[PDB]
Amino acid sequence: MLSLDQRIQTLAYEELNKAVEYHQAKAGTVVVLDARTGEILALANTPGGRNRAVTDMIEPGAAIKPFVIAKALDAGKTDLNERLNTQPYKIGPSPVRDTHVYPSLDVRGIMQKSSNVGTSKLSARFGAEEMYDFYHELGIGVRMHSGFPGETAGLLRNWRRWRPIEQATMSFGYGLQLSLLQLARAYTALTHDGVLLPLSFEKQAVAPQGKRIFKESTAREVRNLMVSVTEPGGTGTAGAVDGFDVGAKTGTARKFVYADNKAVATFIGFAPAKNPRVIVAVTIDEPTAHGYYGGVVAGPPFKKIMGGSLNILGISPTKPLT
């Protein structure tokens, strides 16, 4: 009747509490979607006061980067061969920096290493109004109308109020806010070959009519780029799943005072990367023990939830098991 798959939800709820307790976090959330139909297979929240996946508005941090890269590729403002100067720079007083000083990176490196500089430079190739409409067409600031009271629209500030630094920080996930469900929805544009899905709490006999945001070719090429995140040399190797190519993104969103230690560890990805079937999104709110970063904190729960979901759904491994 409903789209909930109890086998996946119980797996997700248990793996979530495991991670939340181990790292002594304030809260956590997991979303599992059918990557081809948008059916919500699992929605787990801890300490399960409210449905945080739908209600809690967060700055996504680095999790939004693949959409800026996809947009730059879709419109032809960059390509897969271009190497971008990724030295840290400033816009007036405000700095734009990565964790490491990379002299140059292509779009694959920007995804792989999670480069704020590279992503902001690609975004700066669009006008403020262009990015505003892009973010709004991704559903940022658009209510899900899931039915749960306390649902949030999200925050997308009017483009006319954007300072140049603010457009830059939005490109790597600060200055706009959305729920984990909204963020998981947006990734259907990458898995469903450029077509954004509306999501559904009930079973779907066929994928509903979505809305195209990217060319099919753009979505496929971006998916390949994101597999470098879980492969050695990427920030999300802790989310690799045995027997699959996993395209994913990690982020450590910082919170208001931006604090250097209070942060929401995020890990979101899909598999099988080339022909995705499952989206898994994990957020761990304010971990205080055994790590800080989305990769190390939310990676392991993603790994087990993704691998179990693929197994539960009977998805054949693409590579030999180890």
Author numbering: 236 to 282, 296 to 505, 509 to 573
What sentences appear in the manuscript?
In order to provide a direct correlation of the dynamics observed by NMR with affinity for ceftriaxone separate from acylation, and elucidate whether pH changes and the H514A mutant have a consequence on the PBP2–ceftriaxone interaction, we introduced a catalytically inactive S310A mutant of tPBP2WT (tPBP2WT–S310A, hereafter referred to as tPBP2∗). To understand how pH affects the structure of tPBP2, we determined the crystal structures of tPBP2∗ at pH 7.5 and 9.5 and of tPBP2∗–H514A at pH 7.5. In the structure of tPBP2∗–H514A, also solved at pH 7.5, the β3–β4 loop of molecule A is similarly partially ordered, and where visible, it adopts the same inward and twisted conformation seen in the tPBP2∗ structure. By contrast, there is continuous electron density for the entire β3–β4 loop in molecule B, indicating that it is ordered, and it adopts an extended β-sheet conformation projecting away from the molecule. It therefore appears that mutating His514 to Ala increases the ordering of the β3–β4 loop in molecule B. In the structure of tPBP2∗ at pH 9.5, we also observed complete density for the β3–β4 loop in molecule B in the extended conformation. Importantly, the loop is ordered in the structure of the H514A mutant, even though these data were collected from crystals buffered at pH 7.5. This suggests that His514 destabilizes the extended conformation of the β3–β4 loop at pH 7.5 but not at pH 9.5. In comparison, increasing the pH to 9.5 reduced the affinity of ceftriaxone by approximately 4-fold (Kd = 0.45 ± 0.06 μM), whereas introduction of the H514A mutation to tPBP2∗ reduced the affinity by approximately 15-fold (Kd = 1.6 ± 0.1 μM). As both increasing pH and the H514A mutation favor the extended β3–β4 loop in solution, these results further support the notion that the extended β3–β4 loop has reduced binding affinity for ceftriaxone.
